Amino acid sequence: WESLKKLLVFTASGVKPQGKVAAFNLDGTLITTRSGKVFPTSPSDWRILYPEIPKKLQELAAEGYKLVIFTNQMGIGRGKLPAEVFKGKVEAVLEKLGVPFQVLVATHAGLNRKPVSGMWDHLQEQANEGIPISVEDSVFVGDAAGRLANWAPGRKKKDFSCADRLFALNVGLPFATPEEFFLKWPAARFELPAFDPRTISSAGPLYLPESSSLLSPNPEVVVAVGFPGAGKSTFIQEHLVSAGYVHVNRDTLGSWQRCVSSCQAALRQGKRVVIDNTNPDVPSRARYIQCAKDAGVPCRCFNFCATIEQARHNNRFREMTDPSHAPVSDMVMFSYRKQFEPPTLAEGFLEILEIPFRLQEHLDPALQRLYRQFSEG
DNA sequence: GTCA
DNA sequence: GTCAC
DNA sequence: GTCAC
DNA sequence: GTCAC
DNA sequence: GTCAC
Ligand SMILES: Nc1ncnc2c1ncn2[C@@H]1O[C@H](COP(=O)(O)OP(=O)(O)O)[C@@H](O)[C@H]1O
Ligand SMILES: [Mn+2]
């Protein structure tokens, strides 16, 4: 065993560096509960999932594969499951399996939690003896495979997650469910998430209508509207603030009232101001429209188009890339969704720019890779 | 993020 | 300093 | 309660 | 956390 | 402490 950075690593005696791997998930793939319940009642509540398993694990072992387990255990980092308790469930599990295994445990959220590919990377980079690992000559077996309800005669309930299949996808590993793999069952029906980060691009206009202009040389108030994670601050900094707009932000000032004051003062200095809040509904936007009317200046709306799933994906990406910032929770997202009212001219706007979400152009490579990965099961 |  | 938000 | 598989 | 008290 | 899930 060893305790690393948001990661656990049990390495067995007899585990040998190899250039192909056969990796599995733990719960639901190698073992299951005797209870028939999701989580283990006793710490004795576990049995091998199929009797075929140790036999196949032995063939693979001799056919040269390195044997590895990729398991999410966040209940650990969240204090719902003491490490040493779990630390030895797998030690136990290993013996009944017989074969030498290498175990990688994702204790927390972030790059290491499947479907994101951290644990895999940690293996090719640090956990072998530098010997490369052929992705296509490898394989991942997992039960979190997004299978539909009633995916087989016996099996009624839909999978709780598509995390294992998506992990495979992000890596490029061939994938199979424990039944397809161990029992030679035929591929089951399944569905992937509706939002696919791989097909997001930079193609198309930065804003609509294209006839309009992003900036104005005269004082105005620009009111952003959009989910947290829609990319408002990033866009506003790159195109408005760096050109002289005063950046007014509740996150920074503490209250809408202070935003209003600060907007008022900026207009008094003859400046152009942008309100970088979520501003989801008519009453939130009216605050700033009123300021514009009072100062006798135009008010425009930048309406950020990111969908909830796009914004959630960005939020996950922020957690992994920018930790000093506090994670927005889904509750915040669902609340925005219920509050939301489309911006319209009747509110008193001079115009409304729609700002579609467009992948960042010259994005650094290694972060493009990360951004491209499915980040939730 | 928000304080409606 | 407490309060509703 | 909001980061158990 | 800030607002209005 | 509130919210939607
Ligand atoms: N156009 C874009 N392409 C790729 N990533 C983006 C884009 N806009 C924002 N991001 C990333 O998404 C996250 C949210 O950005 P941010 O501007 O803070 O959103 P908001 O201000 O709407 O909450 C950040 O990680 C940021 O780097
Ligand atoms: Mn922001």
Q: What is the C-alpha separation between A71 and A244, in angstroms, rounded?
A: 49
Technique used by the depositors: X-ray
Token digits for A267?
A: 């207009």
Token digits for A10?
A: 């049990």
Q: From the C1' of D5, which residue's alpha carbon is nearest?
A: A27
Phi, psi of A71 (to 5 degrees): -130, 135
Report the amino acid identity of residue A114. K
Q: What is the C-alpha separation between A198 and A187, in angstroms, rounded?
A: 24
**Ion ligand 2 contact residues with beta carbon within 5 A:** A 233
CB-based contact A302:A223 (threshold 8 Å): yes
CB-based contact A320:A111 (threshold 8 Å): yes
Is A177 found in the same domain as A235?
no
Is A114 found in the same domain as A17?
yes
Rounded to 10°, the helix A308-321/A365-372 angle is 130
Q: Which of A90, A105, A103, A94 is nearest to A53 (CA)?
A: A94
CA-based end-to-end distance of chain A: 27
Is residue A154 a known part of a binding site? no
CB-based contact A69:A103 (threshold 8 Å): yes
- How many structural domains does chain A have? 2
Give the distance between the most distant pair of CA atoms in chain A.
80
DSSP H stretches of helix in chain A: 52-62, 74-77, 83-97, 118-122, 163-171, 178-182, 232-239, 250-253, 256-268, 282-295, 308-321, 330-339, 365-372
In terms of Cβ atoms closer than 10 Å to its own Cβ (0-12, 13-18, 19+), residue A204 is exposed
Of the residues A160, A192, A224, the one at which a domain ends: A192
Of the residues A159, A192, A225, the one at which a domain ends: A192
Is A271 found in the same domain as A123?
no
Radius of gyration of chain A (CA): 26
Element (H, E) at A66: strand A66-72
A326 CB contact with strand F at below 7 Å:
no
Is A351 found in the same domain as A247?
yes
Is A294 found in the same domain as A205?
yes
CB-based contact A151:A190 (threshold 8 Å): yes
Q: Which of A354, A359, A313 is nearest to A202 (CA)?
A: A359
Counting every residue, how long is chain A? 377
Is A213 found in the same domain as A126?
no
Bases in strand B with any atom closer than 7 Å to a protein CB? 1-4
Is A216 found in the same domain as A335?
yes
Q: What is the CATH number of the domain that holds A146?
A: 3.40.50.1000
Looking at chain A, the number of H-run helices and the number of E-run strands are 13, 14
Q: Which residues contact A265 (CB under 8 A, 6 or more apart)?
A: none
Token digits for A295?
A: 């100062």
Is A92 found in the same domain as A23?
yes
β-pair type (A273-275, A221-225): parallel
Is A199 found in the same domain as A187?
no
Is A240 found in the same domain as A107?
no
CA distances from A307 to A24, A210, A303, A331, A356 (A): 33, 21, 12, 16, 10
Question: How many CA atoms within 13 Å lie on the side-chain side of A138?
Answer: 23
Q: What is the CATH number of the domain that holds A265?
A: 3.40.50.300
β-pair type (A246-248, A221-225): unpaired
Q: Which residues contact A121 (CB under 8 A, 6 or more apart)?
A: A111
A334 CB contact with strand F at below 7 Å:
yes
A47 three-class SS: strand
Q: What is the C-alpha separation between A104 and A76, in angstroms, rounded?
A: 14
Is residue A77 a known part of a binding site? no
A254 CB contact with strand B at below 7 Å:
no
Domain of residue A214: give its range: 193-377
Q: What is the C-alpha separation between A31 and A28, in angstroms, rounded?
A: 6
Is A153 found in the same domain as A95?
yes
Is A127 found in the same domain as A54?
yes
In terms of Cβ atoms closer than 10 Å to its own Cβ (0-12, 13-18, 19+), residue A242 is exposed
Token digits for A72?
A: 């999410």
